[PDB]
Amino acid sequence: YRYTGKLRPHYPLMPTRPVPSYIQRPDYADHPLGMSESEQALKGTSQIKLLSSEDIEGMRLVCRLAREVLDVAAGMIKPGVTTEEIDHAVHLACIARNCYPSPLNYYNFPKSCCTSVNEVICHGIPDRRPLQEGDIVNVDITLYRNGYHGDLNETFFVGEVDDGARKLVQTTYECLMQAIDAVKPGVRYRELGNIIQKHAQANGFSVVRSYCGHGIHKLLHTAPNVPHYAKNKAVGVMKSGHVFTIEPMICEGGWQDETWPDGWTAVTRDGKRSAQFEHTLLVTDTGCEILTRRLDSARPHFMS
């Protein structure tokens, strides 16, 4: 395999960590290929669930717990910590809150969260690589609780970073916040990609095309599909009671991606850096509620 940049996988992986059976599991957890039957059933529907008051409550609870678990991981971002050690603590922190870590065995994904360094766009597999000064690292957390998934991510700084890093990370966050700012009943899902691409292009950056935000609730990924680039052809219109993610991946170079032989790790075909942020959103009459927001702090971690 021709690697697109410096970064390499670092094996062996620690034996897959188990989840005590007192935690409720999503379907895919015991499917031998990790397929979700309930997700396959709704495949090829463009039709968007309206959350009940009880759905909202489940989404609120799971998303707040997912925040807590991401806040845990954010505390560990220093040089010499391995993505594995992060995922270990994430895995434990999910157990303590009676949540199943949603990535675990999702289509055979073998770990409990996604850790993406530098040129990795998304879906990095926690491994033995110690984080190095100047790295950017995204941790993507998803928890499953009492039927509901909650999904968020932030990129972080590893020690001191270069001016390029700061600007990519900053800009990626602004792209997310600007798209969230436009969420309200009436808007076309396809519009967020216009706003995201417009601000990224303005700062000299590209928008990854092969990965999209998604609806999320009883299923981990479902409708809508929500592309992050301009003049996309997404279908649907926002309504109060829709829940979905915005999760833009932005790049220092071009937008093209390819997947490592592990079948998961997406990287920039050009080897340049990509940053991502993600929130799960609920549409309300006024605008939208950020379910995965911090409650204790004005800003994402990187801002401090």
Ligand code: MET
């Ligand atoms: C291998 S699981 C990846 C899920 C990720 N949290 C997402 O936003 O889709």
Ligand SMILES: [Co+2]
């Ligand atoms: Co994903």
Ligand SMILES: [Co+2]
């Ligand atoms: Co090494």
Ligand SMILES: [Co+2]
């Ligand atoms: Co997501």
Ligand SMILES: [Co+2]
């Ligand atoms: Co995510």
Ligand code: NA
């Ligand atoms: Na990255």
